[PDB]
Write a protein that binds this ligand. Structure first.
Ligand SMILES: *[C@@H]1O[C@H](CO)[C@@H](O[C@@H]2O[C@H](CO)[C@@H](O[C@@H]3O[C@H](CO)[C@@H](O)[C@H](O)[C@@H]3O)[C@H](O)[C@H]2NC(C)=O)[C@H](O)[C@H]1NC(C)=O
Ligand SMILES: *[C@@H]1O[C@H](CO)[C@@H](O[C@@H]2O[C@H](CO)[C@@H](O[C@@H]3O[C@H](CO)[C@@H](O)[C@H](O)[C@@H]3O)[C@H](O)[C@H]2NC(C)=O)[C@H](O)[C@H]1NC(C)=O
Ligand SMILES: *[C@@H]1O[C@H](CO)[C@@H](O[C@@H]2O[C@H](CO)[C@@H](O)[C@H](O)[C@H]2NC(C)=O)[C@H](O)[C@H]1NC(C)=O
Ligand SMILES: *[C@@H]1O[C@H](CO)[C@@H](O)[C@H](O)[C@H]1NC(C)=O
Ligand SMILES: *[C@@H]1O[C@H](CO)[C@@H](O)[C@H](O)[C@H]1NC(C)=O
Ligand SMILES: O[C@H]1[C@H](O)[C@@H](F)C=C[C@@H]1O
Ligand SMILES: O[C@H]1[C@H](O)[C@@H](F)C=C[C@@H]1O
Ligand SMILES: O[C@H]1[C@H](O)[C@@H](F)C=C[C@@H]1O
Ligand SMILES: O[C@H]1[C@H](O)[C@@H](F)C=C[C@@H]1O
Ligand SMILES: [Ca+2]
Ligand code: NA
Lengths: 497, 497
């Protein structure tokens, strides 16, 4: 292992500094012996997924907080965790020296790092691009004869995705999302602003747009990349808004229902890509359960929809129980998946706060809340940005777990990296959320899961300043006596057999 | 009477220029005889509530669009229309010479103007203030011995409100809303940011905050002003958001429920202000019907709640049927009221676009949609702003139907003013929405109401470029043959007996 080289930028915690020759890393992952637990600890004070071990004991006495595992009580199975290979992320990563690039990719995708198994891939340009383009800009090409991947794909995104997949031990799932169609398919004839596809579902405009998804998947398959899933549209509600500043395509839930039933579903289903999953919504969770009711009560749309993708940006408006909870209750066989999150997109939010513990706690608090309300995965936005939070053609600068400093051939791993890693590293695909009952009222955020192989993982987040002694009971194995320090996050793992 | 002096600022339409000696106005109503209708027409081309009259026919033949009044299909009674007397609006109005001031107030409040009958009054400071203050900034003053109105109230707002009332021939209803409590009642000790009242409903903090509402109403009563209603908090969800940039006070729906049941409801009820109405939510309509269910299913909260106030800012997310419609279905005896709207609060929106027809159409489309889904009133934000869209201590600049140019002792009446006046002038308190059906699919927004005197009022908005020839049928009087020009709004009046 190599420890965090800390650096303060005057925010509440430190970044870890990496460069061509040095990056913090883990030893190969193993379980300790039966009767022993592993603890990984990060703290605002500067600990970064530090490994310690403790005994699992037969007995426990006291009035202190007890968290009892309910291994029998089974909820959702996890798909995974990861981040977005935008044009901006690819430009920032490739601006590093080759050896610094490999340390950045290993930080995310290897077992020496935090084991990402999801990459979100924009279908052509978004705000996190320096050029506005689609795959089919030649006007009125309804045959899509002039469809092609430009260098942003063939020289930047695709070679980096190959390198991430070569570094991973667990299979990586690619998820594709479009921001805009070609402008000649749009009511407003622009990549941005208030605008939808022309005409109506089932017509030439909608058939062309559905065929564009197949052409994209065909083009990535020529480069030997296969997709796990696509979303029906990034933030379809954005294209309903006067003056929307960057690439968008407006759908009402009824429009999305009919597009999916008539065009996108059947076009994917009758293609070599019929196994690729389709996720609906890809938008704020306040739109649930309404959007789920509109699309999924139509059996002709419902038969094509695998999952519901959610964005975190207005989660303050949207209590988990009334949105995620109610959607699961109504449509329990349709998975919920968190497809995009970043801090810094609000006008008052500073783009980049190097070393922000607050932004780390926002990430882990969101992931825990999502996992407690049936969500099967959580996806970061840009994998890497510059110290400005760009590049971004409309200056919609945001924060990222890794900030590249090209003048120093350096990258900074922020608290958000470690907060996400406390989940991504220790919750492999197929892990099943299980119950975890508190003996009393407490200020902690916690979730428990069981690995496919039967091992236990518990994540404990303390967003308070107060240390909280606690015990974890596994009814078949015993008791973990521990503490949750103020401004900490812990991941606990142990064999059950 | 006195026509628009048009000026173009290079946007889609003209503003009407007013100064110390000249402002556009109306003549008194002539009440045309049975068999004649009145038409008020505004157009992007520059017509400003121009009056024409036409015949009503016994008969109609054709395949053209027919709108049929259903006078026996009766819905909500209207409370009214108006705007907000913020510190910013008061400073802008008082920056004019006294003659220009009275022409501005006459524009809004007189029968020679557009007959406003609602004024929303911030309870102490908001973003549209040049300094941050509450009425009780002396620390830990739980007795509220040091509660007092500053000069923003006693020298600016209160005298201007008295002047508006005197110019109005219609009874004016005052609506009060707080943004923040004293910081010493808050978890975060700041006017802004993520923070709620300390403790829990029914405690000293919540009792003091409820008493502050009574002290506010007592102080305004010392100045000879009485309120129609208060809201429980301006945008309570804002206080739940990290770094929220201006005055706020966070409540979850459960917190608002328990605050109303235990503190605000009983405190107002046991005061000389027991007749003042209490409106809940005062927030984005996407929070409906959830907030209505959380608050109104508690009988101890429900007995104090007159109505639900909604803001328009995230209407693009929130279909009227799924929000206002469902809330009306579930809680038909709890009135819905639109308490705040402005254009320019989104980061990509230019603060002020002098003469924007687009912003005018946003207002009338919102008012018509609200009226078609049971809403009893519609309230603008700042009554007036400067050309920068301020002043505003956090530079959250926005647009206003009247813009004051202090350097020229001039104010500009924008399309938003006329689009609102198409409703406010012709739909007094007690008007009842009635049924209006179309013979075919159309691009028009239309609503029919019956004046208390029994006369008909129909507003027709055309947001398309295409002239639409139209017939209106009133089964009591016969047929109006008319045309809805592209980018027009019309109000139609006629006697029914
Ligand atoms: C890439 O980053 C690594 C890690 O920061 C850089 O290595 C480090 O270089 C500095 C300056 O030479 C070393 O500082 C020194 O520490 C010794 C005691 O260990 C102290 O006596 C000196 O006064 C000084 O503070 C640091 O030890 C060293 N760290 C490691 C782990 O090698 C490296 O230079 C960077 N590479 C490039 C190409 O910029
Ligand atoms: C307040 O606004 C009104 C309306 O714009 C201003 O009135 C306008 O004033 C100009 C300058 O006096 C008038 O122009 C003159 O018209 C006469 C013919 O009547 C002509 O002989 C002169 O050569 C000159 O063009 C204009 O007619 C008048 N408009 C109206 C509608 O009254 C007024 O000046 C403004 N006052 C202040 C203090 O800003
Ligand atoms: C004008 O409208 C009146 C009212 O409907 C028409 O009169 C009636 O015509 C219908 C259909 O032909 C008859 O069934 C009714 O019995 C008539 N009612 C009355 C009260 O007379 C009239 O025909 C129309 N005039 C024209 C020129 O088309
Ligand atoms: C579009 O594709 C056709 C057929 O492959 C080709 O001949 C034509 O030149 C292309 N047009 C452009 C603008 O590239
Ligand atoms: C608060 O009110 C009390 C009682 O009227 C008074 O004695 C005291 O001076 C006031 N304090 C301030 C700071 O105004
Ligand atoms: O394109 C992204 C944007 O960069 C981020 F700010 C939020 C939502 C959008 O999907
Ligand atoms: O750093 C400590 C941790 O805070 C506590 F929970 C137990 C063991 C670790 O060494
Ligand atoms: O205070 C107002 C603000 O001025 C406006 F931008 C929108 C919402 C708030 O209530
Ligand atoms: O300006 C016109 C209007 O457009 C039409 F509806 C009828 C009468 C008016 O003169
Ligand atoms: Ca707002
Ligand atoms: Na840039």
């Amino acid at each position: 292992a190599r420890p965090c080289i800390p650096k303060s930028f005057g925010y509440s915690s430190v970044v870890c500094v990496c460069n061509a020759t040095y990056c913090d890393s883990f030893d190969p992952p193993t379980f300790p012996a039966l009767g022993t637990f592993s603890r990984y600890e990060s703290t605002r004070s500067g600990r970064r997924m530090e490994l310690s071990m403790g005994p699992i004991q037969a007995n426990h006495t006291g009035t202190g907080l007890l968290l009892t595992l309910q291994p029998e009580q089974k909820f959702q199975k996890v798909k995974g965790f990861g981040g977005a290979m935008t044009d901006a992320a690819a430009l920032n990563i490739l601006a590093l020296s080759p050896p610094a690039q490999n340390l950045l990719l290993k930080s995310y995708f290897s077992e020496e790092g935090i084991g990402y198994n999801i990459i979100r891939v924009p279908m052509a340009s978004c705000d996190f691009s320096i050029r506005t383009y689609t795959y089919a800009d030649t006007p009125d090409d309804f045959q899509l004869h002039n469809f092609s991947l430009p260098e942003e794909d063939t020289k930047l995104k695709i070679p980096l995705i190959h390198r991430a997949l070569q570094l991973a031990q667990r299979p990586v799932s690619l998820l594709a999302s479009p921001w805009t169609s070609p402008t000649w398919l749009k009511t407003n004839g622009a990549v941005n602003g208030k605008g939808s596809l022309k005409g109506q579902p089932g017509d030439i405009y909608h058939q062309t747009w559905a065929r564009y998804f197949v052409k994209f998947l065909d083009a990535y398959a020529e480069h030997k990349l296969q997709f796990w899933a696509v979303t029906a549209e990034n933030e379809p509600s954005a294209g309903l808004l006067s003056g929307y500043p960057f690439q968008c395509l407006g759908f009402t839930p009824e429009h999305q229902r009919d597009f999916i039933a008539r065009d996108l579903g059947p076009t994917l289903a009758n293609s070599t890509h019929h196994n690729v999953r389709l996720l609906m919504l890809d938008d704020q969770r306040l739109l649930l359960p309404h959007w789920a009711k509109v699309v999924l009560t139509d059996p002709e749309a419902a038969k094509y929809v695998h999952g519901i993708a959610v964005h975190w940006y207005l989660d303050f408006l949207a209590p988990a129980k009334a949105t995620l909870g109610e959607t699961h209750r109504l449509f329990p066989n349709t998975m919920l998946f968190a497809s995009e999150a970043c801090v810094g997109s609000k006008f008052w939010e500073q783009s980049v706060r190097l070393g922000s513990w607050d932004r780390g706690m926002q990430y882990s608090h969101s992931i825990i809340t999502n996992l407690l309300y049936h969500v099967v995965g959580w996806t970061d936005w840009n994998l890497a940005l510059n110290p400005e939070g760009g590049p971004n053609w409309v200056r919609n600068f945001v924060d990222s777990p890794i900030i590249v400093d090209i003048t120093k051939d350096t990258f900074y791993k922020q608290p958000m990296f470690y907060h996400l890693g406390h989940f991504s590293k220790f919750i492999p695909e197929g892990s099943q959320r299980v119950g975890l009952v508190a003996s009393q009222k407490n200020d902690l955020d916690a979730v428990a899961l069981m690995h496919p192989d039967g091992s236990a993982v518990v994540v404990v987040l303390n967003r308070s300043s107060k240390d909280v002694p606690l015990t974890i009971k596994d009814p078949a194995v015993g008791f973990l006596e521990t503490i949750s320090p103020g401004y900490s996050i812990h991941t606990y793992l142990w064999r059950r057999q």
